[PDB]
């Protein structure tokens, strides 16, 4: 008997770090057996894409190794020309320790001149970042700001400036120090 | 209140050795079910880290998967209404062939056997044959494909020296030994 698609397990909100298997469940019933197809943020994933175990039909869907881009809203639909076609929407919440895309490194730079060291991080939670000067917490004044991207500005560098740096990044699932670089000031 | 049923019969599942292979074991009830995974009758041990078990325990996933893996799977479903219910299915696992002890370059006298390993494994189970120069080897008098996949030599002539290699076919893959040399001595 024919039978329009039901959907019987909908999409789930899938909670995964980066570097995980990741598995969306959508299990169809009909008759005929359906079509079912998947988008990502309204993007068609291609199913002969080799990023993804696709199984049982097109039912199960599996992110073999789940990267930041992978976050977003998963749908399935079903179709076997049967009745209305039917679809689920749930989402994929990518979760990072904190990963620092751009540390800083050394530099000689004349006094009088502006020094930006940046520690460009990526992660989810949103990283927050500090710095280390020596092997101390860095006392912040009044030529010295972290920017919002992480970056450590220093207006007007001084001799007294020079010495060792690095970075620490962190959130809930981890915390990233960058190696220590030297700041030399040429006077 | 809904006794459980089991919607998605487990199946047959193939995946190569360190793929990611999942059973799906979708289930309506209410209250929401308990289920249990054995593999052989044998409950799913979880210490083990290459288990992932998901969506309420409907999904089973072996992150990467092992020749001691195969074997038969079953859910089972219990939410204390009615009575519980059970689904079985099988993982194959597969491999492409793999040349486990391939041939080595031979310096041999005239007259002697030779004897060029080809020890493989696979599943299915690959077929071994001989590739002398370019142009497949054919068996004789003298030549045997032996059924460990080794080319044994009977009484080695100088004809016989050049370069050979095995090759290990299945369905699922061929693999093909690196070209050794075969010095036929005249002294």
Same mark, same amino acid.
């Given at each position: 008997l024919p039978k329009a698609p039901v959907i019987t397990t909908p999409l789930e909100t899938v909670?995964? #770090? %980066?570097?995980? %298997?990741a598995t969306f469940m959508c299990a169809v019933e009909s008759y005929p057996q359906p079509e079912i197809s998947w988008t990502r943020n309204k993007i068609l994933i291609k199913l002969f894409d080799t990023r993804y175990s696709i199984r049982e039909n097109g039912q199960l869907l599996t992110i073999l190794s789940v990267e930041d881009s992978d976050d977003g809203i998963y749908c399935c639909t079903a179709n076997n020309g049967v009745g209305g076609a039917v679809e689920s929407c749930g989402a994929l919440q990518v979760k990072m320790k904190p990963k620092i895309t751009r540390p800083p490194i050394n530099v000689k730079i004349i006094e009088g001149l502006k020094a930006v060291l940046p520690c460009t991080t990526m992660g989810n939670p949103k990283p927050s970042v500090s710095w280390i000067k020596g092997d101390s917490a860095l006392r912040e004044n009044s030529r010295i700001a972290v920017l919002e991207?992480?970056? #450590?500005?220093?207006?007007? %560098?001084?001799?007294?400036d020079a010495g060792q740096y690095r970075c620490v990044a962190k959130?809930? #699932?981890?915390?990233?120090?960058?190696?220590l670089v030297k700041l030399e000031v040429e006077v």
């Amino acid at each position: 008997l024919p039978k329009a698609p039901v959907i019987t397990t909908p999409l789930e909100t899938v909670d995964a #770090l %980066v570097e995980e %298997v990741a598995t969306f469940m959508c299990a169809v019933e009909s008759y005929p057996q359906p079509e079912i197809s998947w988008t990502r943020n309204k993007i068609l994933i291609k199913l002969f894409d080799t990023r993804y175990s696709i199984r049982e039909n097109g039912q199960l869907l599996t992110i073999l190794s789940v990267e930041d881009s992978d976050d977003g809203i998963y749908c399935c639909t079903a179709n076997n020309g049967v009745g209305g076609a039917v679809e689920s929407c749930g989402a994929l919440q990518v979760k990072m320790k904190p990963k620092i895309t751009r540390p800083p490194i050394n530099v000689k730079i004349i006094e009088g001149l502006k020094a930006v060291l940046p520690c460009t991080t990526m992660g989810n939670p949103k990283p927050s970042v500090s710095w280390i000067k020596g092997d101390s917490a860095l006392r912040e004044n009044s030529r010295i700001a972290v920017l919002e991207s992480g970056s #450590l500005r220093i207006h007007n %560098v001084q001799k007294e400036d020079a010495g060792q740096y690095r970075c620490v990044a962190k959130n809930s #699932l981890g915390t990233a120090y960058s190696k220590l670089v030297k700041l030399e000031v040429e006077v």
